[PDB]
């Protein structure tokens, strides 16, 4: 009953968006060296077309500060119709929740304290990206780490944007992503000395933007934050 389904999802999008928290809720987040942080998660998803859409997803957990994989669960499943633009997350995210639930059941001591999501946070067409959606359904702190600048609220990959990227001279350097509204939606981060291409970081849930950006940088042994890099490898394996 697709009209019923999409209508339900539209209501849920509004309700879930209102649940997004953009401040820190954990003691470890307020410590300058993130004292108390031991486990960082990574999530990545790739889709495949077919009679049914398939999703290849990976949840990994890494030790922190060491960034070594301590848990992994990577899967390919079919997702159920209806497939509606702007609402694929309403099939995708419950599958990701299932991964988290399986971790809680099978290895509860390895539950991540924060999840780095390969995808968008509040820097999103409707201010409710996959990282927000996963966060509110699990109550886990989540960060949206995007590889491209999302064109919302007047953000443009224009000449000035490109100039600001050049002026990111070293790993850790940032510049704010500020909408036409004047709202700070996220930060561009040069994640590593080796790469000149920035990551675009925004809050998913239960973390502040400053903390999200600093933690993201600290997870970058290479350009892509290690939990995402590891999840990416495993969700391309299934592709």
Residue numbers in the entry: 9 to 247
How do the authors describe this structure?
Removal of inosines from genomic DNA is dealt with by the base excision repair pathway as well as endonuclease V (EndoV), which is considered the major player. The mouse genome encodes a single EndoV homolog, mEndoV. Our data show that mEndoV shares substrate preferences with hEndoV by catalyzing cleavage at inosines in RNA and being inert towards inosines in DNA. The structure determination of mEndoV revealed a protein fold which is to a large extent similar to human and prokaryotic EndoVs.
The structure of mouse EndoV reveals a new conformation of the highly conserved strand-separating wedge motif. In contrast to all other reported EndoV structures, the invariant Tyr91 in mEndoV is interacting with the backbone of the protein through hydrogen bonds to Ser60, Val61 and Leu87. In order to stack with nucleotides in the active site pocket, the mEndoV Tyr91 must undergo a transition to the trans side chain conformation for χ1. The latter two Cys residues are conserved between mouse and human EndoV, and with similar conformations and local environment in the two structures.
